[PDB]
Amino acid sequence: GKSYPTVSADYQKAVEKAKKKLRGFIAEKRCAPLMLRLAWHSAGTFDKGTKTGGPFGTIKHPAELAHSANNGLDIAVRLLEPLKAEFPILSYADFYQLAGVVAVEVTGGPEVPFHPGREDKPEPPPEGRLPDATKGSDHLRDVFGKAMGLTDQDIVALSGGHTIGAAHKERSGFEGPWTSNPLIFDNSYFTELLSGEKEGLLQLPSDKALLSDPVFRPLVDKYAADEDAFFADYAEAHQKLSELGFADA
Ligand code: HEM
Numbered sequence: 195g196k197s198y199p200t201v202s203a204d205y206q207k208a209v210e211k212a213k214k215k216l217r218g219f220i221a222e223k224r225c226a227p228l229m230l231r232l233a234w235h236s237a238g239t240f241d242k243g244t245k246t247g248g249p250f251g252t253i254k255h256p257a258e259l260a261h262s263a264n265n266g267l268d269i270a271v272r273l274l275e276p277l278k279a280e281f282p283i284l285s286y287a288d289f290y291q292l293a294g295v296v297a298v299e300v301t302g303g304p305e306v307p308f309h310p311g312r313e314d315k316p317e318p319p320p321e322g323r324l325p326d327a328t329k330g331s332d333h334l335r336d337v338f339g340k341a342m343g344l345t346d347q348d349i350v351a352l353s354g355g356h357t358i359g360a361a362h363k364e365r366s367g368f369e370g371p372w373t374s375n376p377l378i379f380d381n382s383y384f385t386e387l388l389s390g391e392k393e394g395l396l397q398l399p400s401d402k403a404l405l406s407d408p409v410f411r412p413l414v415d416k417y418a419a420d421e422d423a424f425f426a427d428y429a430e431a432h433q434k435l436s437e438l439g440f441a442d443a
């Protein structure tokens with residue numbers, strides 16, 4: 195149910211140019227996972243009943259960066275500031291969601307469709323909307339479904355973003371990568387989740403909760419068996435996530 199706003203031809207030119215520059219910058223800096231987390235934490239605060247939070251540029255504000263769920267994201271913000279300054283016409287909201295999309299692409303992931311026009315909003319959402327890694331399926335549904343309005347399929351597919359990157363004991367407290375190849379976007383997150391724990395690889399309780407839920411589990415299996423199906427449903431879910439509250443909810 196989206197109606198995307200009209201942006202000027204100069205705005206579109208800058209999107210295109212910024213997308214190319216983000217590719218090169220993110221690849222060189224090795225920060226795709228962090229950029230994906232930044233985009234996801236920007237968007238994931240959306241509350242459908244109040245139309246508050248969501249991907250509207252507010253993650254740049256010191257007050258939002260201070261949320262405990264956002265430890266380490268000040269690094270991402272600082273890393274993007276010089277590049278953003280080359281594209282003064284773009285909203286931060288658009289810029290961060292573009293950086294998220296590019297992060298997925300440059301690590302070998304699906305091409306997530308991108309539409310411009312998010313406006314930067316003045317007020318961050320209240321803290322505490324982002325998911326708790328120590329919790330389980332009910333919690334995931336409260337956050338992704340009751341607040342964000344995404345589906346059970348979306349929950350599982352988006353969890354697969356853990357296919358890139360790592361936790362850090364100085365940020366969340368958890369430590370290490372989910373996969374043996376943490377700068378490669380693939381279905382390995384689901385193959386590891388299924389195989390049991392392997393030395394040196396991380397599983398949050400929230401990841402584990404996918405295995406014992408009756409709706410999540412068949413999706414895990416599908417994605418572990420079929421990376422193409424993972425990529426389709428991942429791209430669908432990331433697009434929806436990046437558009438929460440934008441161009442209609
Ligand atoms: C499902 C609930 C989720 C929970 C509870 C969760 C929790 C976490 C935690 C605790 C970390 C570690 C942060 C650190 O210590 O550095 C992390 C990292 C990450 N998360 Fe999530 N996450 C979830 C969903 C997602 C989603 C939906 C995405 C993207 C689609 C995502 C992408 C990432 C990425 C890319 C990293 C790694 C960042 C890096 O390498 O620096 N997560 N997540």
Ligand SMILES: [K+]
Nearest residue numbers: 357373375378
């Ligand atoms: K991987």
